[PDB]
Structure formats: structure tokens, C-alpha cells
């Protein structure tokens, strides 16, 4: 029966930041790199792996210069750094806010084993999640981030991880749109294996029906919604090989036969893609000559600061040179969630 | 796993089939009305339910002059009619396609009741379907008809009722394109009742939801499928008034939050709605501000025949004026579906 | 909600049915074997496959001394069957009848191919299902039967033909009780391939779960009901060998953690088990030190007609030494299903 | 696929570990009461919410003569009492277990209000809910309490909440398993309304399926498990009035239609009942002439310290006179549990 989840102000006001996420140009960083995350890539450059340094690494992206602006809708941070300051004692929020960006926060607490299962997981975070979300709000958060790992293999994904992964996608996305937080649905299929392309669409159509369908089940408002998934690929250890064309037809495929038209945009994760690879990808993607009725951007983390944490190496003589490196992927992935990347 | 059911030439037929019949400014005639339906049709004009009758008023609305052409991109027919022919001796599956229509044939046997359920059904016409309709491709055929009913109440449409109606309609479809029929899923969902708009865009949603969960279940070909469902609308005797805006923008937004884009079109019911009315509120749909990324036509019956069959009477003398009611219906329709109605 | 599906009388009619059948030492003959199942059995002893020599087969089984009476509390026939008459005159029907058994009738129509599995199916025999129960109520049945065939294989039963056979079983679950006839669930899991009896167990739990949530959805009196699943076994292509009492506690580890202790009774199938090994296996589980709340019996087909066929070879001449053999494992296994058979 | 979650080994110490807390003549003392639970009972007796007064109320029911020994098969605690101990700095999970008792601990953190629902619930306590059994597991802890809220109510309990609280009963238990935990699935039904009976026996019915069905998606040993199910009975509001023996049949039918054999035991909440209430309920069910293949035993706590608690007052002098209460109801439902119960 009709028993309101959501007053139309606040779907407005989930709708409305939505949109501002995903504006026309505009995608997302994410920083949101956990603890042991964070801690391999400060390690791969010879950096200990400090609170100042993390504090360091963080505001040398969230403060490049202006020609960003346009390219970044929104940005996702961990725990941590949504509490943490730049330089000029200006909260990590503002500094964000300020350049016209939407601030995001991490809120799953990792994956955990699913018993039964081949290597299978579900991811938790749902206590207390309420209260979480509603101080995250208070502090200049208006989205959040939850990701789910499914894996392509033998007897993978499982029915129980599809249905529980699929449910508690839900379960986050209910409790963030009751405090105006506006959830990002991240139903992440691993590209391992050896799988080719048509497997990967396959496994992605029925984990984005499944997902939508729990979605419908728990009454949440898609237009206060964003969908970070996979691209549709063939897995790292395929031997046949594909054109950034045929991956581009294969994902939008994919999306146009599982993602309502009412969710409001398509923030892909670049899942062990080269800086360029994911850039390009994007934008055959935008392309694809199929009708998109949902803005396909990104939310790339490494496919954004590969390229900045090689340049930085953790001196801070290096502050520009490594900024001059994001600027460039952001400014390459704004023009390919737009179609016109031209590498 | 990846076992398909279509072959690329199968999804190709299917999918090109299902684009003609909703292309720009087209719509379906539904002539499809069964023994019990068209005998009080012929009643309201005190007309003999003859074969030679059904045969004549059939005739009568299949050989209309070529003003319907551009509007009629598929016409559904029964067993009966399909196997009958014009004046001529011409088969009228040959007359309809002459025309460029497509010619569509219903394979479902009628409601059933649910056991358990407060006078909820589901429908039959499953057994033997598959041969039935590698027949009715060879006789002409090349989309089918199935229609589940709905019904909005106190605890309806139940779970069990939802359930197993969208199963249903997937086994359905999943047997049509096995046999390079485009099957047109039709879950109307009755406007009987005193229930509201949000109430019907509400369960319009819920079963939506449903009926694609399903079809994905069933691994159907969404391209090379149509969704004939009722518009969202008020119950026949709710004391609310609405405008043809607010219907029109309910149900797209019923059907953006749970029809892929994949999906080829849709056909609209008018279930119960006057000529008129059916015309304005599919010219409002079409007209709404959101965007639709499928096709939003016409698959009337009594909205393109009531005027017709009126001006027939029985007398063949009245064959003209009859026609002419009816052209000018589907003159007055295709241009709805396309935003465009005059009055 | 709370809507009757059966009243009072109706489940008192439906469990004293089903619990006659099964009533203790009792058992199923299975003689419902169809057109192109019976078709090879006559041909197998070189006999012409003609409506007199079924009638008269039939009749061979039907009409075994007395000494049959304790052992056979109900037998199923197929269409053609339940029509038919002993030399006397005497309809079928009432044979059995006055011998204390209970009359059944097959009302599938035969498995289907399931689009998009790998060889997997699902049946059919839903349409006009109910006139159909109505009527061979009136003509002296009171149970009827289903078979729903899974296998064991890759990726098989997948989620779809246990989800889709499933649904169809308790549909047919359904109509049978609305006609006061005790349906006897049949979701049998072939015995073919080199599976070993842990994956067996494994996929009749799974099985056997998601059938019984189908029977809750639809509503069906579980007292008015009987389950026919195969028992559980190595593939015939097994390596690995194992004894009557580990394939017995396997059956019944299976059926307690799935099988509700209200479902009336169990009939085991012999799935291609011989005369004995079908014997000794029911004898085993009914010797399981293990608590059983339900009757654990026999619905036998050729474990019961084997040598009887044989020793007929379709010489009338040859009707006692037939009968004899029949009369043999039916006391055979009225004692199986009472746990003391004497091999 | 066959992938164990659990190794013979560890069913053992599970199934040993269920059958050892409803072993014949014993039950559950449910002194797990949370922080605002307990604190209302302190409260209806002028009593400090102190750690002291609660430390001292629970000393004094865990150490009860030993007459409540074979009466008390198992006792549930809350996370502070699972750490405190008895006057001789004897750690409570000792007390109880010296006595015989299993020591349980409940791990849920309350329920959560479900979006979109009429005042339904969910509950939450899966993160962390690992190691933190692992802990309990290390201090004594055998068997795990997690409660799930259900209502009855013109449109509830919903799809929605039936579904959710199933899966997270089963991910909780799939959880306990794991660490050797033995979970005991609670899906309570309030018994808030004006419904009757056969409403709530109707929901239960419902409800039940819908949790084993989920328990067997999660591959969870039923063996292992136990089920603190509320006893069918009639609204607190109820006009209609019923006899022990009519909520002794209806909760027994719920139970058998329901809950599979293998399910090793039953321990029944009180849910506001009076003692005696409680404990003759329990009698009627133990008497109920249907087969029942698992214990029927009690898990109550007011049931079982409703007397207690007054007998105390928070007076210390009052120690004997509230532990001969306890003792009084630990006796009276020992017999009720054997159906030999006799006011
Ligand atoms: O004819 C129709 C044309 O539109 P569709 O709904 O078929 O598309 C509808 O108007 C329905 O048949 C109508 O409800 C007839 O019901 P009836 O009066 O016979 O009891
Ligand atoms: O007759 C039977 C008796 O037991 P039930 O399984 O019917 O109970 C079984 O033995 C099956 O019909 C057998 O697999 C026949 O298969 P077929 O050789 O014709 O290809």
C-alpha cells in the first residue's frame, strides 16, 4: 500500500544533488581509498603511511587548480578525510564545495564471506548507519558510497550473492535517502578471469536486473540515485581481444536492457584500467550510437591519480607537477563523458 | 551461464519486427476480441453473432481506405479472423500486410482464477503454444497478444497474484521469440475501483517492476518485445478529478522507474476510456517534458472501433460511413503518438 | 490476507484421500506410463502396441488376486486407462476401487524445452486443467499426478527450471484441490551422469526447498498433498559406490531438513532402479534410525511391473504367471515401506 | 554447487550443542533483557538502574537451588552480564554452567524502522558480528539470540518485511554458525491488534515459510539451529476468545505446515503473557494430539520472572523469597514442556 517513504521536498532534494553530480562534463574523484587501501599506494612511492601524509596527498588533489571545476561534480572521501583540514585551516568539505563540488562519503565497513560459497561476499556497514548518515549530512556530505563485490568464475556469481549483494545495496540506499544522503548504488562484478566479453554482459545484465528489482522492493527513489558499475569487459585474463568500440556497444547494451530510465546517472568505476584506457572507453561509451536516457560519467579513483601519486613520490616540491597530472585526467574524462576525447 | 536462446539473426528478426510495428506516427488496431467479447459488440447493434458478421465488421475495419495506412503499424487478430478472407478471397493477414501493417495474433486462453486469492486470476494458453505459433508465423503471424488482468482493491493485486501473472507472461514470451514471434506482454492493471492516481501509479510500478524481473528471469530478448499496459489513471470511480497532464506524467514516471530502454515500445490500452479521451491522454504522454526512451503509441480497440461499429449498425449499406469513423481514429491517434492531436 | 482457498470439508476430503493412499504397508502402483513410455515397454517383448493390448496389460495388473489388496492403496492410470473396462464390463476404475485402492490420473501433458538452458525443461498441462479435475473427479479419481524433470549436470538445475518447475507444480497443486483432488507433487532430479550422492543430496534440498515455498505462495493444504521425489543417489555414471543405508540416510537427511512434517506422505520413484535395488533402498529408509513424520512409501512403475511384462510377453496364456510376479514386489515392497523386507 | 560451509566436525558441535538446551523436561531462561528492557523492570519496583542491582537481580536467578537444574537447558544474557560475576567473583557463564545450562548471548542491536512500510522494522547487528562471536564463543557462549519484529496490521507484515527480516535472520545465523555459535531464529509477530486466530495462525504460517526458505538460500544447518517463534494465538485486542487446547492446535498446524523435522527444536516466547498463561499454552501444545517432530519447549523471560522481580523489590533480605518464584515458574514450565504441566 502507499505509505510514503519520501515527502516530494525530499525527493527534490535527493534528485537535485543527484543531477549536480552527474551535470553535463562533470565526474567523480574517488578518494575515498580505505586504510589498507591508501596504505599500498603511499607504498608504491616510497611514502610512510601517515595521518599528515594522507592529510598531504589528499589536499594536493582537492586543491588543483580551477580548470577542475567543471570536471568535478563530486568527489567521494573516507571517514578520515572528511574530518581533516587544508593548509589554510579550510575543512576538507569546503575546499571542495568551493570549487562547485558535491562531497561524498564512504559508509560500508568492507566485504565479509558468504558462507557456503566459492569465494563469495557480501559487504556490511548497515549499523547504525542512520545516525552515520545523518551527522555525515550535518557535515557537508550529500551522497555516499557502497560497494559490493560479485566475481565472474565457475559457479560465480551465485544466486545467494547476487539476491543478499542485490538486498543490501538496498538496505544503504533506503537508510541514505531518509537523511537526505544520496546513494550510489556500486554493484561491482571483478573483471578476473578468463571470461570473455559476452560472459561479462551476461553476468552484468542479471546482476543490474536483480539489483534494480530489491531496489523496487524497498521502495527507493531512483532519481535520488547514481549507478557506479562495472564497464562491460572481458576478463583481465582473456585471450580474445576487443575494440574499445565493441566493449563501448556491449556496456551500453548491458544498461539499456537493466537501468530504468528514471536513475538518474551512470558513474562508472575503472576497475584496473589505465588512466587512458578508462578515458577512452568512456567516451566510445558516450559514442555508442544506442539511445542513453542516463548521464554516463565517471567515478574513477586510480584512472585519476595514477599519473599524480607517481609525480608527487611523497616530496612536496613535487605538489604541482603531480596536480598537473590529475588536472589532465580530469580534463580528459570530462570531455569523455561527453564524447569528445581526442588523445 | 551464457546459453543463448536467440541467435543474432533471431534477436535481429524480432527486433525489427517490433520496430515497424511502433514506428513514428504508427499504432495497433486490437481486433483481437474473443467469442464472449465481440458477441456484445455485435449485441449493442442488434446484429447476429454470426461467423459471416464477425467476418464482414472484421473486413469492414481491414480494408479501410489508405488515409490508415501511415497509422496502423500492427493489427492483432483471433484464431477465427486470422483464417478468414476479404470479398476477394483475399486472406486478411494479406489485406493488413498489403496495407504495411503487421499482422499480430492472440495466443492466450483466458483468465483463470486464483485459488486463495480474493477474486485474483491469471491467465492460460501456454500448452501446445509453441506449435501454435510456429503455425501462426507460417500463416502470416509475427507478433502475439497475451493479456494478464489486474485488479486494484484492499489486498490486490496480491504477491501471489503479481507473481505468478509476470511469470507467466515471461513463459509466454519466452515461447514467442522462441518461434520469431515478437510477444507484446500486456499486465493491464483494471481501472475499476474508487482508488486514486497515486494508488495506480503506485501498483503500476510495484507490477512493472515485477513483470521485467521476470522477463530477465526467462532470459527474453527485451528488444524485440512490446509492453502493452494501462495508463496511469484514477479508479472509474474515484471522486478526484485530474487533468490529462497529471495522467500523462504519472505514467511516464511509472514507466521511467521500471521499463528499460531496451524495450523496443509501448502500446497503450485504453481500457475503458472513451475515444476522445484515450486520444488527449496519449497525445498528453507523448507530450510530457521528461524524457522516454521507447516508443509511446496506441494498441486500441474499442478507442478506434466504438464510432465504427456504431455507424455500421449491421447494414451493409453503412460500410462507408463506418470506415470512416474508424479513419478517422486512427488519423486522430497517430497523431497523438506523436504529440500532435488537434482536438 | 486471509481468503479461503478450501473450507473445512474441502481439506477434510483431501487429507483423508491422501492418507488412504499411504495408509500403513500401502503403496502406489504407477500404470499411467503414456503414449510413447507404454510403446517401448510392449516393444520390448515383441507386442503389437494396440489399444487391446493395454487393456488387457492394464487389466493383467488391476485384476491380481486379493493377496495385492494390503500392499496397493491407490494406482495411477493414464487418460486412456481411466476409460477403459475389464473383460466383465467393469470400468477400470472400479476394479481398483473394489480391491481398496484409490484411483489416480496423470494430468501433465509432458515436459517442454526451457529457452535459454542447457536442455533443461519444464511441463505443461495447465490449460482446461480444472473442467479436466472436475470431470475425472465424476469419473472415479481422486489424486492425480505431475512429473516436473530436473537433471544434474554443469550448470543444471539452474535458477530458472528450479524456479520455473517449482511454480508449475503448485499451480497444478492448486487447481487439483479446488476439485477435491489430491495432488501428488513430482519434481523429480534425474539419476543421469557421474554425479556422487553428496551432489544429489545437495541439489534435492535445494530443490525440494524451493518447491515447498512455491506451495506456500500458492496456497496449497499440504495434508492434501503427497510427494513423489526420486531418492537420493550417485549418478548411474558414479565411480564411487555406496550402500542402501547410506543412499537411505542421505533420502532422509534430504527430506527432514525440506519437507514439512504436514505433507501427508512421500511416494519414492524408482528412477531406472531395478525391482530389487528399489526394494532394498525403500526398506533401508524406513529402517533409518532417524525420525520420519511423514509415510514413506512406494509409487512404483517398472520396480513393480518389471518381471511381470516379462513373463507376460504378450501371450494371454501367460496372465497368472504375469500376475504372479506383480503380486511378488508388491508384497515386496508393502513390506519396504514397513521396514521389513526379507530379501 | 557443493561448496561446505560447514565440516562434519562442526555439525556436530552444533547439533549437540541445539539438542543439549531443549533436551527432554528443559527449556530457556531469557535474561538477555537490553539496556531500556531491563530498565523498565527495575523501574515498576523502585529500583536504581544500576550495574550493581542488575549485576545482583541476575546473580540471583543464575544461582537459584538446584531444583532449576533440570528444568533450565539453556539461559540467555545480555553483553554485561555475559562479563559479570556472582559475589564469589564466580563468572556468571560459570554459574549457569555448572548448573548444566548452555550459555547464550544475544548479538542483535535492536530494529531499525523500514522505509516505506506502516511502522515496520528490520534489525541490525551483522557488522562485526564475526569476531565478536568468536569472542563470545571464547567466554563461554554457545548459542547466539538475534530478534526480528513482526506485526499484524491491516497491510502488514509487508513483502518487503517478511523478506528483509528473513534474509537477515539468515545471514545472522549463517554468521553464528561459523564460530561454532548455535543461532536461534526469532521472528516474532506481535500480538498487538484485534485480529483473530486464525489470522495470526494464517501469518505465521506465511511468515515461517518465508524464514526457513531464506535459511536454505544461506545453506544454514537447520540441525543446528533452534526457533523462538511466538505461539499462535489471537490479537491482544481480540473479542473472540479461545481455548488453550484451539491455540494449542493452531500453533502446532502453523508449526507443522512450516518448520521441517530437522529443525531440532522450538523454544516459544511468552510475548506478554501471563505466567501461568504461558506455561498452560505450552502444556496444550506438549498435548496436542498431532505429531510434532521437534521440541516444544519454552524460552520465556517475564514468564519465568514476573514473580521474581516483585518478590524482590530491590530489597536484598528479599533473596529467598524471589528465587523460590523463579524456581516455582523454571518447574511449572519444565512439566509444560513435557505436557504434564498441573495447576
Ligand atoms: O476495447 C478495449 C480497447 O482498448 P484496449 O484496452 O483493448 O487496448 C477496452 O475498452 C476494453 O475491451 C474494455 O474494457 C471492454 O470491457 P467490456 O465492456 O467488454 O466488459
Ligand atoms: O518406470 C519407472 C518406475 O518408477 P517411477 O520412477 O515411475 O516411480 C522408472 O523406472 C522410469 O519410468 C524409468 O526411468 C523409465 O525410463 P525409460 O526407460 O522409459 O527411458
Same mark, same amino acid.
Given at each position: 500500500?502507499?505509505?510514503?517513504?519520501?515527502?516530494?521536498?525530499?525527493?527534490?532534494?535527493?534528485?537535485?544533488?543527484?543531477?549536480?553530480?552527474?551535470?553535463?562534463?562533470?565526474?567523480?574523484?574517488?578518494?575515498?581509498?580505505?586504510?589498507?587501501?591508501?596504505?599500498?599506494?603511499?607504498?608504491?612511492?616510497?611514502?610512510?603511511?601517515?595521518?599528515?601524509?594522507?592529510?598531504?596527498?589528499?589536499?594536493?588533489?582537492?586543491?588543483?587548480?580551477?580548470?577542475?571545476?567543471?570536471?568535478?561534480?563530486?568527489?567521494?572521501?573516507?571517514?578520515?578525510?572528511?574530518?581533516?583540514?587544508?593548509?589554510?585551516?579550510?575543512?576538507?568539505?569546503?575546499?571542495?564545495?568551493?570549487?562547485?563540488?558535491?562531497?561524498?562519503?564512504?559508509? %560500508?565497513?568492507?566485504?565479509?564471506?558468504?558462507?557456503?560459497?566459492?569465494?563469495?561476499?557480501?559487504?556490511?556497514?548497515?549499523?547504525?548507519?542512520?545516525?552515520?548518515?545523518?551527522?555525515?549530512?550535518? %557535515?557537508?556530505?550529500?551522497?555516499?558510497?557502497?560497494?559490493?563485490?560479485?566475481?565472474?568464475?565457475?559457479?560465480?556469481?551465485?544466486?545467494?550473492?547476487?539476491?543478499?549483494?542485490?538486498?543490501?545495496?538496498?538496505?544503504?540506499?533506503?537508510?541514505?535517502?531518509?537523511?537526505?544522503?544520496?546513494?550510489?548504488?556500486?554493484?561491482?562484478?571483478?573483471?578476473?578471469?578468463?571470461?570473455?566479453?559476452?560472459?561479462?554482459?551476461?553476468?552484468?545484465?542479471?546482476?543490474?536486473?536483480?539489483?534494480?528489482?530489491?531496489?523496487?522492493?524497498?521502495?527507493?527513489?531512483?532519481?535520488?540515485?547514481?549507478?557506479?558499475?562495472?564497464?562491460?569487459?572481458?576478463?583481465?585474463?582473456?585471450?580474445?581481444?576487443?575494440?574499445?568500440?565493441?566493449?563501448?556497444?556491449?556496456?551500453?547494451?548491458?544498461?539499456?536492457?537493466?537501468?530504468?530510465?528514471?536513475?538518474?546517472?551512470?558513474?562508472?568505476?575503472?576497475?584496473?584500467?589505465?588512466?587512458?584506457?578508462?578515458?577512452?572507453?568512456?567516451?566510445?561509451?558516450?559514442?555508442?550510437?544506442?539511445?542513453?536516457?542516463?548521464?554516463?560519467?565517471?567515478?574513477?579513483?586510480?584512472?585519476?591519480?595514477?599519473?599524480?601519486?607517481?609525480?608527487?613520490?611523497?616530496?612536496?616540491?613535487?605538489?604541482?607537477?603531480?596536480?598537473?597530472?590529475?588536472?589532465?585526467?580530469?580534463?580528459?574524462?570530462?570531455?569523455?563523458?561527453?564524447?569528445?576525447?581526442?588523445?
Amino acid at each position: 500500500h502507499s505509505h510514503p517513504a519520501l515527502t516530494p521536498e525530499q525527493k527534490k532534494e535527493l534528485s537535485d544533488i543527484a543531477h549536480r553530480i552527474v551535470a553535463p562534463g562533470k565526474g567523480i574523484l574517488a578518494a575515498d581509498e580505505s586504510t589498507g587501501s591508501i596504505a599500498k599506494r603511499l607504498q608504491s612511492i616510497g611514502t610512510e603511511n601517515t595521518e599528515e601524509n594522507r592529510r598531504f596527498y589528499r589536499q594536493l588533489l582537492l586543491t588543483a587548480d580551477d580548470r577542475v571545476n567543471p570536471c568535478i561534480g563530486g568527489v567521494i572521501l573516507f571517514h578520515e578525510t572528511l574530518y581533516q583540514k587544508a593548509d589554510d585551516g579550510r575543512p576538507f568539505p569546503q575546499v571542495i564545495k568551493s570549487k562547485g563540488g558535491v562531497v561524498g562519503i564512504k559508509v %560500508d565497513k568492507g566485504v565479509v564471506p558468504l558462507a557456503g560459497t566459492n569465494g563469495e561476499t557480501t559487504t556490511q556497514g548497515l549499523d547504525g548507519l542512520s545516525e552515520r548518515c545523518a551527522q555525515y549530512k550535518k %557535515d557537508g556530505a550529500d551522497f555516499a558510497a557502497w560497494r559490493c563485490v560479485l566475481k565472474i568464475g565457475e559457479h560465480t556469481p551465485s544466486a545467494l550473492a547476487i539476491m543478499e549483494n542485490a538486498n543490501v545495496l538496498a538496505r544503504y540506499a533506503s537508510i541514505c535517502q531518509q537523511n537526505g544522503i544520496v546513494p550510489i548504488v556500486e554493484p561491482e562484478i571483478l573483471p578476473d578471469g578468463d571470461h570473455d566479453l559476452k560472459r561479462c554482459q551476461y553476468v552484468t545484465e542479471k546482476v543490474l536486473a536483480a539489483v534494480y528489482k530489491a531496489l523496487s522492493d524497498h521502495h527507493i527513489y531512483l532519481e535520488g540515485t547514481l549507478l557506479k558499475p562495472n564497464m562491460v569487459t572481458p576478463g583481465h585474463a582473456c585471450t580474445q581481444k576487443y575494440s574499445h568500440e565493441e566493449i563501448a556497444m556491449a556496456t551500453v547494451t548491458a544498461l539499456r536492457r537493466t537501468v530504468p530510465p528514471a536513475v538518474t546517472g551512470v558513474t562508472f568505476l575503472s576497475g584496473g584500467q589505465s588512466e587512458e584506457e578508462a578515458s577512452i572507453n568512456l567516451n566510445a561509451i558516450n559514442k555508442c550510437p544506442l539511445l542513453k536516457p542516463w548521464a554516463l560519467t565517471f567515478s574513477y579513483g586510480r584512472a585519476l591519480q595514477a599519473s599524480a601519486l607517481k609525480a608527487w613520490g611523497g616530496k612536496k616540491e613535487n605538489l604541482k607537477a603531480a596536480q598537473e597530472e590529475y588536472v589532465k585526467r580530469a580534463l580528459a574524462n570530462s570531455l569523455a563523458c561527453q564524447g569528445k576525447y581526442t588523445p
